[PDB]
Amino acid sequence: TGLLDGKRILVSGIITDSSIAFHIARVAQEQGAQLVLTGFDRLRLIQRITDRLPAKAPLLELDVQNEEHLASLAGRVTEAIGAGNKLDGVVHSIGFMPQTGMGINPFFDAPYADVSKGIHISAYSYASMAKALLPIMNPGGSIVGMDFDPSRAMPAYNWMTVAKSALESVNRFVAREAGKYGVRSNLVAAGPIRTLAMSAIVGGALGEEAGAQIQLLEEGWDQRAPIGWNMKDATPVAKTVCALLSDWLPATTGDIIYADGGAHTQLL
Amino acid sequence: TGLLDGKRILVSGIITDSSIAFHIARVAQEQGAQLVLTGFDRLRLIQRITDRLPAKAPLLELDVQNEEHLASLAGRVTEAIGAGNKLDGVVHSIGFMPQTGMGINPFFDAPYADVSKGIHISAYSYASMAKALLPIMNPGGSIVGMDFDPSRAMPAYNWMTVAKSALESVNRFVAREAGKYGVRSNLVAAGPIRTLAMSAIVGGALGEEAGAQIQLLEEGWDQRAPIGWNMKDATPVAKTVCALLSDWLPATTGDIIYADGGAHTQLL
Amino acid sequence: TGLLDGKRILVSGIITDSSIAFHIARVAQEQGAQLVLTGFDRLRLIQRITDRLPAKAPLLELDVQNEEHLASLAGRVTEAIGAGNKLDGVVHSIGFMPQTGMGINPFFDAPYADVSKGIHISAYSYASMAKALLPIMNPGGSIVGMDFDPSRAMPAYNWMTVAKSALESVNRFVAREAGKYGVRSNLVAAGPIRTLAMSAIVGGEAGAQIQLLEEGWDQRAPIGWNMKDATPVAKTVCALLSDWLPATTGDIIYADGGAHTQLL
Amino acid sequence: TGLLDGKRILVSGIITDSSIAFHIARVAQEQGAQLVLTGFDRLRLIQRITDRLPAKAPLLELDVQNEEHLASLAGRVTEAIGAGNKLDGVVHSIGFMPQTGMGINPFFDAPYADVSKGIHISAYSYASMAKALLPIMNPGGSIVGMDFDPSRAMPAYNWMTVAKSALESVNRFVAREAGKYGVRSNLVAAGPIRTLAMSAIVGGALGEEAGAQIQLLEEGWDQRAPIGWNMKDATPVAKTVCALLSDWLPATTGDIIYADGGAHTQLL
């Protein structure tokens, strides 16, 4: 008997089999959830990736910058899960920032057109997904997004840090709106996981400093985490998200759960 | 469901069937946990109270101020759960503060002897329980204590606030020690629940200020919580603790989970 | 001897004589600072307002959305304070959010074009000002922006809350950049002050707004809070522009009567 | 001319000319304050140390664990500053923790009698000092204590971390009491300064680890602080305290000002 038996959950943000969203979906399925997946831009590729999941699941296009995709999303989900059924959970596992807002590119040289795009996708879209999907969510349901602790500044993450600070504020407002429907909204602040975004976005922006990134991640997380931290294992983050999709954190909303091995609780 | 199937968990802090610990134990048992219970001072009464749980469970004396009780605790638990078995979870649901450190008694008039006693039982005992029990916990295990958000001052809670600020710090250190054993340590910051200790804050169930207390608790929690808050329902807090005793938050330690309906995330 | 004797400080954000920036400038001047002022859009009006300050001060146009204004700003400031002199302080006291992102307008109905504009002006501009001005700041100097505590959600402030959360993060990054020049960057999280922007949050129910501000601030503040008195906020900013908080950067000072430290 | 012209300020916590309190007093005096000083245990020594201040100032015995010293303190201060005059400021720069609660001594082995003592002196005494002195403080006045950021756990500081978490909570309650008198109460969270407490208490407790751990700390502070940090220079901390004793932060109470070079705002 699974933790998410007969729960219908939408999971956004799969692009490879390392994606945090991919492992969220895998664990959600292992625990009995029926999924609907959304993907951006490269749907042929994403389709081959989602075939490696333990179960088949419908896949829908969603570019969170596209008003038409958002306006139609609720309709397309209803059609995929059966007319008269609703969602019990929604997972926002999406982010973007142009190269200029990251890495060794100077912080002050990022033009606002680039920063604005990153905040649109990384923070505002949390509200636009909730707006589109709350009308088809059941009471008891849960919305979850992915965060990276932005309360202190750090090298390289630069304007993505600013986007996450924004996302944290958005989550608290979404929680107010979602409360009317009996729905929780929370973020999971994950420790670092090797994914495409880590490597191509953050690691690409670092140039020949990429060694520096690993060293910092080692300092900031495995060394600090009292139970350690393994950047090649997304399972603990995925389980944490499933905990929030479940009935087992029923009194938590507008909040942030840290799945970082405890690193943020330790100074060194 | 079986969230805690075949997990052996020690639960401290039962005194009535309204105790947060009582509901923690009930839900743990409903989810398949084999419990060991500890009780303070009034064991005859506590025995009759624990009989109302869904399953029988051994009951052990533990006054956290008593060195002998603590020195023997590990031994007595091993005897109750079977030689060669260990605990998978531990719940600290314990607190105390003398009357002088609370309510309308002026903050500056609490003598240190009284405050010290309250900090001993409410904060330091979180470390002494961990010290006694870690040697008989399995890797994967979880220690959980109960908090009330002390980051801002408030009427009446007075020196208990100071004890909770201390407990929050103790938890982060216990997390470091527990990490060596592959064990997590976390607090649940609960919203207010009608218990015997709550009445104590204002001098018993008809204290001068009882009416004021209820109004403030409604202002601070049900009115702020986006999903609302019901002070007569401990279940959501109990489920939140079981979430932490389970395998489903494996990467969270040294931390605090808020089970307050989201109230601490909202200003008004 | 005044607290800012012979310090050259740029102050942005004056629009009326209730503007927080206006009272910052007044106090800075009372304490011996030579000011340069910047104003947006309504410079004729702003000029008449700045005439009510204790001392005359040059006034420069700056729309923080305008790349040309920002590119020329350093040059225009050098010309106004004398070639070979630099700034010792900079005050960002600027904000904006379209009506759709605020008040009773549902949170979800604000389009991103509107939210983006508000974040541009209210948060990103803190970085673009620092970028423009750091090259002409002296070691020891201080940059200060105005914040409103966004760590918990609230009625009406809506997307401005999100812009302030962003500003807080921007400040921490600016602090890193400013450190290279020996310059501090901090925000002052003020309690509520009756200004033109405050009326904008709703328009001018206003009754509800005042009640909430009394609940959230005067009632919680252990030393009380008076929304018609900007002086304490202005002094707190001058403290940060002075030499007296030399080891504080990337940080937030709360000038709210202590309200954020009390739950009820 | 001076920032504290004609302000009468009590400064506790001088033991050597490296003490943070000694530099607070020096700068206060340079800025025109008339001081009253308090000292613990070694008054002969403290007297020779205070002679090296720019101005003479009366010195009073105060062991914050002694009820008689506290009961008589207001009276003795009135006598020293002139009957009818009051204090405008009070500086608590006092701390203690037994060796067992610090360094490489295991966290769980500190007996509560030792931790209690440390909390008494390091946290509760901030309330007793305020209780004794508020009745002779002018409206506008300021109380200030010294903190070391305890929001995350760390090596070695151990139970002192817990005492600082307690102090932070006590400061918020003192702010409530002090508000009735028109008085502010705040802490300054200083970066690390080479003082007797650093070397004898913390450094002593580290044993053979003292040298390396302290060097890494000095490197990592200075590394995180965007404006850098020099552990041999107390002046910036002393100035920060004088800012709070002055009229220039009139709307800040119950709060914490970080004088750490910005280090706590940066993760790495």
Ligand SMILES: NC(=O)c1ccc[n+]([C@@H]2O[C@H](COP(=O)([O-])OP(=O)(O)OC[C@H]3O[C@@H](n4cnc5c(N)ncnc54)[C@H](O)[C@@H]3O)[C@@H](O)[C@H]2O)c1
């Ligand atoms: N990798 C880490 O260590 C880490 C840690 C904590 C949080 N995060 C967050 O987790 C989330 C997922 O990142 P990940 O590491 O799995 O990376 P990723 O590259 O696997 O995923 C990023 C996803 O965002 C999608 N995306 C980008 N622009 C989009 C748009 N306009 N519309 C819809 N989808 C769009 C991509 O298509 C992709 O599926 C992000 O919010 C990221 O900040 C990453």
Ligand SMILES: NC(=O)c1ccc[n+]([C@@H]2O[C@H](COP(=O)([O-])OP(=O)(O)OC[C@H]3O[C@@H](n4cnc5c(N)ncnc54)[C@H](O)[C@@H]3O)[C@@H](O)[C@H]2O)c1
């Ligand atoms: N009830 C609430 O609103 C609320 C909210 C948040 C946190 N909490 C915390 O929850 C915990 C439990 O309190 P409760 O509300 O269940 O009340 P309660 O009165 O039911 O239980 C408190 C328990 O503490 C025990 N205790 C006291 N001194 C002890 C000692 N010397 N040794 C061992 N046990 C001792 C008592 O025997 C009792 O079982 C406390 O830590 C309290 O601060 C309560």
Ligand SMILES: NC(=O)c1ccc[n+]([C@@H]2O[C@H](COP(=O)([O-])OP(=O)(O)OC[C@H]3O[C@@H](n4cnc5c(N)ncnc54)[C@H](O)[C@@H]3O)[C@@H](O)[C@H]2O)c1
């Ligand atoms: N009044 C309050 O209660 C309060 C509380 C905390 C923080 N704040 C902050 O203080 C700052 C000033 O607000 P105030 O209440 O004194 O307001 P205000 O309405 O007096 O001033 C707002 C100013 O922003 C300027 N501005 C707007 N868009 C601009 C742009 N593109 N370029 C340059 N200037 C631009 C306006 O011209 C005006 O000078 C803001 O950042 C605001 O968020 C206000």
Ligand SMILES: NC(=O)c1ccc[n+]([C@@H]2O[C@H](COP(=O)([O-])OP(=O)(O)OC[C@H]3O[C@@H](n4cnc5c(N)ncnc54)[C@H](O)[C@@H]3O)[C@@H](O)[C@H]2O)c1
């Ligand atoms: N030095 C640092 O790196 C650092 C950083 C931040 C905060 N602090 C804090 O600053 C304060 C001052 O410590 P310091 O480094 O100046 O060291 P220190 O040893 O110079 O000063 C400590 C003082 O505490 C006094 N004291 C101890 N027990 C007392 C008692 N029973 N009654 C009265 N006074 C008592 C001692 O006599 C001494 O004057 C402490 O609260 C410490 O926690 C230290």
Ligand SMILES: N#Cc1ccccc1Oc1ccc(Cn2cc(C3CCCCC3)nn2)cc1O
């Ligand atoms: N999706 C997405 C995404 C978009 C922009 C930037 C990062 C994105 O994904 C992340 C991918 C990885 C991480 C974790 N992380 C952050 C970093 C940097 C590099 C130095 C260490 C600390 C900051 N390295 N790993 C956080 C993320 O938000």
Ligand SMILES: N#Cc1ccccc1Oc1ccc(Cn2cc(C3CCCCC3)nn2)cc1O
């Ligand atoms: N065990 C225990 C215990 C010991 C002393 C004081 C309280 C204790 O348990 C609690 C009991 C109730 C609550 C919740 N609560 C808080 C308050 C104050 C006073 C009324 C409004 C502001 C919070 N009243 N009830 C929190 C608790 O930690």
Ligand SMILES: N#Cc1ccccc1Oc1ccc(Cn2cc(C3CCCCC3)nn2)cc1O
């Ligand atoms: N400049 C500017 C500005 C731009 C958009 C929105 C607000 C702006 O300035 C402010 C003006 C007033 C306040 C304080 N405030 C907040 C509020 C509402 C009222 C209900 C409770 C708190 C949110 N009322 N006043 C904070 C501000 O940042």
Ligand SMILES: N#Cc1ccccc1Oc1ccc(Cn2cc(C3CCCCC3)nn2)cc1O
């Ligand atoms: N007075 C006093 C006092 C009492 C007990 C312990 C420390 C005390 O003063 C301090 C002396 C130094 C510091 C700063 N600090 C912290 C540390 C440890 C060293 C290991 C790494 C960082 C934590 N070393 N210095 C902080 C202090 O509160």
